[PDB]
Structure formats: structure tokens, C-alpha cells
Amino acid sequence: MRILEEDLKNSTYRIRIESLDDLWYLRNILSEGDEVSAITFERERIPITIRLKVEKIEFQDFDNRLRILGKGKHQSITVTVDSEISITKEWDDQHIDLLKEATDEKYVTVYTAVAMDEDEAQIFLIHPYGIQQVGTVYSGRSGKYYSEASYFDQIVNALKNYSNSIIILGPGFARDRFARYCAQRGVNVIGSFPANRTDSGAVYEFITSADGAKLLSNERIARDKEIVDEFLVAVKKDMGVYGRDQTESALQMGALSDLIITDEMFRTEDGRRSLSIAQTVGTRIHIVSVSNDPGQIVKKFGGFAGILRYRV
């Protein structure tokens, strides 16, 4: 994301979408009734009171449903890479952060991860907020025992359409052989790290490992993982709290050191309500995104979770 200009007086920022992921960020930045402005076409502007946003994680287009103000009837703005937008609203800390994050290369890097066996390789894109399965190459080895080269070859083809640093994962050294195979084709990798299985789980676990940390411990995905794990360990050790009621409850009595709520519940009034209470009470805040599995966990628990402390 790129910030073109701003108007402090009217709480506005003009941002330019540069990547697909920028849409995900835009989506989290926009809310209920914000005022958005765009130039449509012999150029004409279109200011709007947002009423609904249409966007699915990993999409390439973003739709702002609305009511024109700059007349009166419903209309719509379609955001895509290269689009420019003026957003007016009250910018709380969470939203300002989304902006600082979207525009910082150090935080939005995308990696291509290949978790492979001797007979199967799954490719994923590690977005700064979640994992996106993007294919699967079977070696067929069982059915042909066969040249591992044409399997490795299948993997390289599936990777041609992407251009991010590569991380190779997997159980038995098939990863090492493949990394060596890629070096001969020019294609160089950060890669090759052991992993129990060959599924998404492997990617998250890599995120959680020493090497994973050195690489992306600051990205959202890694952060949401870190806290939700703490919570999971918390609940096991009888120091955790889940569910709106129970959590809000423990929050109110300054009995919890960490308040974990979801992406979704933050767009909720209780959500925003509890965040401030949390600041009053002296409790750390954590907004986990349902766009990754750590978020999914908290979602299932109700969207609210907390880690206990001796009543403050």
C-alpha cells in the first residue's frame, strides 16, 4: 500500500492499492459508515457512505456498496490493484496500525512454501495474515516403482507463476534433494527445513520454529499464532478463559493479563467496548484474524478469550 496524501483536518488518507494483499488490508480498514471517495470515468469523483463491503480472503477485487454523497441513491466502487481511494473516518489505534503495516515492506512480505514428501508436494503462499493453499503435485511414485526428476519438474512448473523467496519443507530429505535440484536451475531458496507432515500444519509449525521466527516473527500470522498458542497452553494449565460472557466478566474485574478477541468481534460493539475496558484495567490487547487458523480457534471459542492473572 502507498499513502498519496492526507487531510488531518478531515481525518482522511488517500491510499493506492499496489498488491492483492492490499485489498485484505483495505477490507479491515473500512467499516460500517465510513466515507470513501474515488474518481470514476473525462474523470468524475464519487464520495460515499459505505454500507457493505464485498470481499473474500484472497480475492482480486473489492466492492464498496453505498449511498452517494458527492446523488442520494445506492451505487458502488470497485477497488483493484492500481486503484486510488480517499478514506474518511475516525482513526483509532488499530486502524492506524493497519495503515502503518500495509505500507511497510518489512511486514507484508509473501513467501512461497513447498511442503514435500517423496511422493507429494503442496505449495502454499504465506501471506502476512494467513496461509493460502495454491496447488498440489503428486509424484505418483507409489504407482510407478520412475524418475524423481520429472516429479521435481512438475513442482518447478507449478512454481513458475509465483515469484517470492522459496521455503522448502518436509519430512524425509526429499526437500534437500529438491533444493539441490533448484540450485541447478538457477532458482535459489531460503529453504529446506524439516517438518513432521506435509500439510498446512507444517507451515504454521515452521512459522513457530527458530528459523521461522528469524524470518517472519513480526508478521501478523506469526503474531496471531504466538498468542493463541499461549492461550491454548493457558487453558490446559487452568489459567484461561473463553466465551464472551466469561471473558468480559474476568476482564471487568481486572483478573486477566491478556484479552484475545477476533477480527470479527472487533468490528463488534462489545468488541470495541472491551478493548477500552482492557486499557483501563491494564490488560494487554490482541486482535486475532479469522483469516488464519490461530484466529479460527478463537472464533470457535466465541471470539473472546483471556489469560488469567491475580485480580488486579
Swiss-Prot record:
Its EC number is 3.1.-.-. Pfam families: eRF1_1 (PF03463), eRF1_3 (PF03465). Keywords: Cytoplasm, Endonuclease, Hydrolase, Metal-binding, Nuclease. The keyword Nuclease applies. One of its GO terms (cellular component) is cytoplasm. One of its GO terms (biological process) is ribosome disassembly. Gene3D superfamilies: 3.30.1330.30, eRF1 domain 2 (3.30.420.60), Pelota, domain A (2.30.30.870). Coiled coil: none annotated. Its cofactor is a divalent metal cation. Monomer. Belongs to the eukaryotic release factor 1 family. Pelota subfamily. HAMAP family: PelO (MF_01853). The N-terminal domain has the RNA-binding Sm fold. It harbors the endoribonuclease activity. This is Protein pelota homolog. The gene is pelA.
